[PDB]
């Protein structure tokens, strides 16, 4: 699996994350920093939409007489005008925010792909479906290091070269 094919069920620890498999075990984990930052972003967005609304104590209804029909109709015009403006803006705002939010999340999962590729460089094969395969054998300690962003690339340099070289041809 991987972000290219679809999301994961069972990865309930966060919006974004990793799955790994090695000789010591396997399972899901959230990228806790990425997820919390994405959450803070979304939280600020939702709260901005809500908090910027000016809520004041009001008195909406107005009464009119038989010969105040023009005034009644103006009062109605005002309510319909404001209502169409707020309805149009609310519908449109939500649709626009939803397009950006879904794009935001797609961007963030790809950014994790770039985070890992940049960190691993040529010590892992890209699969193309959102996965990477190490050329070197990788235990639980290097899995944590990659997730942390502390992978000691030079440490595995020789092992990965030797394993890539299994298909080098002439040497």
């Amino acid at each position, epitope marked *: 699996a991987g972000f290219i094919e679809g999301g994961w069920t069972g990865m309930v620890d966060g919006w974004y994350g990793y799955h790994h498999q090695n000789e010591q075990g396997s399972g899901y984990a959230a990228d806790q920093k990425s*997820t*919390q930052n994405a959450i803070n972003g979304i939280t600020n967005k939702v*709260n901005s939409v809500i908090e910027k609304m000016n809520t004041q104590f009001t008195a909406v209804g107005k009464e009119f007489n038989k010969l105040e029909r023009r005034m009644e109709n103006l009062n109605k015009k005002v309510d319909d005008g404001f209502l169409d403006i707020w309805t149009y803006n609310a519908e449109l705002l939500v649709l626009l925010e939803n397009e950006r939010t879904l794009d935001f999340h797609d961007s963030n999962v790809k950014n994790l792909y770039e985070k890992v590729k940049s960190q691993l460089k040529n010590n892992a094969k890209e699969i193309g479906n959102g996965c990477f395969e190490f050329y070197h054998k990788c235990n639980n300690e290097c899995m944590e290091s990659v997730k942390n962003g502390t992978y000691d690339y030079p440490k595995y340099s020789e092992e990965s070269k030797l394993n890539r070289e299994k298909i080098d041809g002439v040497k």
Partner: antibody
Framework: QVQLVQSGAEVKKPGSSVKVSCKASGGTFSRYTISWVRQAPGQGLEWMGRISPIAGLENYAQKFQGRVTITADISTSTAYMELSSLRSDDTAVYYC????????????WGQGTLVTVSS | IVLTQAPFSLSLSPGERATLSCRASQSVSSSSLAWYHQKPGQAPRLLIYGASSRATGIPDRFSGSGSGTDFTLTISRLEPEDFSLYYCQQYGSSPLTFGQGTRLEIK
């Protein structure tokens, strides 16, 4: 800082369900993750589960995986824990606690409410 | 993950220094095992945020450190307020498991 207020104590018959509410005040509800913890009489704490009002990501302890539903609604600034198929084994004080982040321990614990399950 | 937080009871005189420690079957994420203090009848209070940060509002008598599968809480200048239960919580792990509870007695 957020302060949490819980519903009063309840007594239930075995097989019935309980819905324990928690309300937040003094801060923004939507900015805290709500985590529910069980205090067994005479014993320590057990985690039951958590919810983020904005992110979802409901996460439940395995023991109650098919029994407890945790919800939140930013509309009322509340969270609920609904536990089905009650057993006498479930007598405990249930605490609502807030956390400043999804991956942080909660420093903002509520009152705790006792739910007793008996004949 | 299995957390074994209460291997012993502890009995101290006020003013003394003592430590408590937690062990686990796997690593608690990265330095993410929190410490709690519970006065009978009260909700648990957070003392240590993560393996070692002091939680806001907590006195300087409390400190701690650790990593992996082995963490320690130290209390110096112990006061009557401290003679209650202690717990560890794996807030950085998939299940946010809690320890058993250790009790501190007054001599």
């Amino acid at each position: 800082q957020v302060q949490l207020v819980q519903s009063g104590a309840e007594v239930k018959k075995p097989g019935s369900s309980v819905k324990v509410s928690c309300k937040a005040s003094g801060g923004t509800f939507s900015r805290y993750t709500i985590s529910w913890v069980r205090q067994a009489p005479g014993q320590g704490l057990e985690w039951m589960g958590r919810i983020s009002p904005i992110a979802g990501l409901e996460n439940y302890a395995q023991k109650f995986q098919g029994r407890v539903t945790i919800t939140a609604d930013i509309s009322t600034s509340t969270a609920y824990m609904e536990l089905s198929s009650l057993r006498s084994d479930d007598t405990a004080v249930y605490y609502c606690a807030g956390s400043s982040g999804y991956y942080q321990p909660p420093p903002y614990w509520g009152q705790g409410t006792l739910v007793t399950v008996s004949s | 993950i299995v957390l074994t937080q209460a291997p012993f009871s502890l009995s101290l005189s006020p003013g003394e220094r003592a430590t408590l420690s937690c062990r686990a079957s796997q690593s608690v994420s990265s330095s993410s095992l929190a410490w709690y203090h519970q006065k009978p009848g009260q909700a648990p209070r957070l003392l240590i945020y993560g393996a070692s940060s002091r939680a806001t509002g907590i006195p300087d008598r409390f400190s701690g450190s650790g990593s992996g599968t082995d963490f320690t809480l130290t209390i110096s200048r112990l006061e009557p307020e401290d003679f209650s239960l202690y717990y560890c919580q794996q807030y950085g792990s998939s299940p946010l498991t809690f320890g058993q509870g250790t009790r501190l007695e007054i001599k």
